[PDB]
Amino acid sequence: PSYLKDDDGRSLILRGFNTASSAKSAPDGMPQFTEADLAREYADMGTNFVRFLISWRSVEPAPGVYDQQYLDRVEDRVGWYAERGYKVMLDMHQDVYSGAITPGAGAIGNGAPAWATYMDGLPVEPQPRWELYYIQPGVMRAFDNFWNTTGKHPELVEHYAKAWRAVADRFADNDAVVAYDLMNAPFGGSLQGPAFEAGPLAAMYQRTTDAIRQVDQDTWVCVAPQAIGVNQGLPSGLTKIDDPRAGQQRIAYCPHLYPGLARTLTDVTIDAWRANTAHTARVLGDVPIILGEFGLDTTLPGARDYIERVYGTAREMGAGVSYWSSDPGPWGPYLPDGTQTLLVDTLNKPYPRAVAGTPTEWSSTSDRLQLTIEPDAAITAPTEIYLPEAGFPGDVHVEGADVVGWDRQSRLLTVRTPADSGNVTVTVTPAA
Ligand SMILES: *[C@H]1O[C@H](CO)[C@@H](O[C@@H]2O[C@H](CO)[C@H](O)[C@H](O)[C@H]2O)[C@H](O)[C@H]1O
Ligand code: NA
C-alpha cells in the first residue's frame, strides 16, 4: 500500500471528517462550523484530516470570473486546521448537479453555478427520496450538457478545469493543503459504467489535473469512480490519469463506500469494495487510497460494529478516512445540543499520524498502540502518534523506539526509530 507524505517524507495515516454538508446551501459557501467546533473535534478525537467542501458556484459565480473573497474565506478556515496540525483535502462538491435544478447553492441539489446549469426546459418533478432527482429528465440533461454528451456545451468541463486551477493557484503554497478531490460523486447522466468512467469522466480528470499542474505541482490530485454501483461494491472502469509533474506521480484514489442477512450482505460488500478499490488503485498506478465518504446513523443497532469493521479495513488497506460527516445529527460525532454520539468513543483511538517510513502493520486499543515500520534513512523527522488521555493519563512507556517528545496537551507522541536494522516494531503503553 502507498501513502501520501508530508514535506519531511513521512507517510500519512489520515483520520477525519467531511466538513461540512451545511456549506452546500450557505450563501457565502462556508460551513456552519467554527474554530471552537474544530477545537472540540480535536480535543475529543485527535483527528488530523478534513475533507473540506468547496463549490464551483462559489469559485466561479460567473463565467471566467473567480471570487477571490470566497477563496479568502476558504483560506481562513484552512488556517484553523493548519494551526492544529491538520492536513486538508479540498472537495469540489456537488450532489444532483446544482441547487438550480428546481425553483447554485442548495440543501439537496448543490454545486454548479446557475450559468453552468442547462436542463433545456426538461422537468424535475418532486421525488420521495432525494437520490431519485438524479434520473429526472432535466437533471439527466444538466449532466449530459456538462459532459458534452449533447455536443452543445464543450466549454463546461473547460470552465470546470480552470475553476480548479484558480483554486490551486491560491493553495499551491499552503502547507496544510495536501489533496484536491476533483469531483464529488461523479454521475454520468445517460452515460453509466465504464463508457462513462473511461470516457468523459477520465477526460475531465486529465484536463483538470493538467490545468491544476500549471500552478501547483505538488498537491495530490484525487480522483473518484462513478458513485452509483461502485459505492455498493461493483468494479470501476476508471482508467489511469497522467500526472505531468516532474518525478513521481501524485494521484490518489478517493472512492466512497455506501452498502443476520443484512449483516452478511454488509460484510461481503466491504470485501467486494476492498477488492475493487485495491484493483483501481493498481490501475491508476499503485496509488494511495482515501475513503472520502462513509457514514451512517450511529443510533442504529450494530452501528459501532460496522464502523469499526470499516476502519479496520481502511487500516489494513493503508487508507485515509474522512467520515460523512461532522454536521450535527445521529450520523455525526455530536447531536445538535452538542451531546456526543457513540461515534466519538468509537473514533477516539490511538493511531500513527505521520510515520518515519512505511507502516506495514499497526493496531490499537484504548491503552495500547503497536506499529511496524519499514525503515527510511532519508527521513529525519520523528514518527508522530496520537494517544487519547482516557487510556494514557500520564507518561508513556515505549519499546522499540526512543521517546523524542510527549506533548500531553496536544496528545502527540514523537519517537525515533533505527533505520539500519530492518523493519522496526514500536509498542506504546501507559506508564506504570
Ligand atoms: C454521499 O452521501 C452523503 C449521504 O447520503 C451525501 O450527503 C447528503 O447529501 C444530501 C443531498 O445534498 C443532503 O445534504 C444530506 O443532508 C446529506 O447527508 C453526500 O453529499 C454524498 O457525497
Ligand atoms: Na500544500
Ligand 2 centroid to Cα of residue 6, in Å, is: 9
Ligand 1, atom 17: nearest CA belongs to which residue?
A: 21
Which DSSP string do the residues of 151-179 spell out, in sequence order? SS-TTHHHHHHHHHHHHHHHHTT-TTEEE
Ligand 2 centroid to Cα of residue 248, in Å, is: 16
Ligand 1 centroid to Cα of residue 367, in Å, is: 35
Give the strand pairing for 412-416 and 320-323.
unpaired
Ligand nearest to C-alpha 89: 2
Cα 382 to the chain's mean position, in Å?
25
CB 49 within 8 A of CB 15: yes
CATH number for the domain running over 1-13+348-432: 2.60.40.1180
CA atoms lying within 13 Å on the CB side of residue 410: 14
Ligand nearest to C-alpha 88: 2
**3-state DSSP assignment of residue 26:** coil
Nearest to 64 by CA among 203, 212, 165: 165
CB 91 within 8 A of CB 51: yes
Phi-psi region of 194 (alpha: psi -120 to 50; beta: other; left: phi over 0): alpha
- Report residue 388: phi and psi, to 5°: -65, 150
Beta partners for residue 368, in sequence order: 365
Amino acid identity at 96? V
Domains of the chain: which residue ranges? 1-13+348-432, 14-347
**3-state DSSP assignment of residue 24:** helix
Return the CATH number of 14-347, one of 3.60.15.10, 3.80.30.20, 3.40.50.2000, 3.20.20.80: 3.20.20.80
Alpha carbon distances (Å) from 171 to 206, 220, 252, 300: 20, 12, 18, 39
**3-state DSSP assignment of residue 416:** strand
Ligand 1, atom 10: nearest CA belongs to which residue?
A: 108
Ligand 1, atom 19: nearest CA belongs to which residue?
A: 95
CA distance 190 to 327: 32
Spatial neighbors of 247 by CB under 8 A, at least 6 apart, are none
Q: Ligand 1 test: best mutation among 21, 222, 294, 325, most atoms within 8 Å of CB? A: 21
Q: Is 219 exposed, middle or buried (0-12, 13-18, 19+ CB in 10 A)?
A: buried
Asked whether this chain's domains 1-13+348-432 and 14-347 adopt the same fold, the reply is no
What resolution (Å)? 2.1
Cα 65 to the chain's mean position, in Å?
27
Q: Tell me the residues surrounding ligand 2 (ion) with CB < 5 Å.
A: 177
CA distance 272 to 290: 17
Nearest to 279 by CA among 317, 310, 327: 317
Experimental method: X-ray
**Torsion sign over Cα 145, 148, 150, 153:** positive
Cell of 82: 493548519
Pocket of ligand 1 (CB under 6 A): 21, 24, 95, 107-108, 110, 130, 184-185, 256, 293, 324
- Ligand 1 atom closest to the Cα of residue 106 is 12
CA distance 407 to 425: 22
Give the strand pairing for 11-12 and 351-355.
antiparallel
Helices (H), ranges, 131-259: 137-146, 156-171, 194-196, 202-212
Give the strand pairing for 11-12 and 358-365.
unpaired
Ligand 1 centroid to Cα of residue 126, in Å, is: 17
CA distance 45 to 366: 12
CA atoms lying within 13 Å on the CB side of residue 8: 13
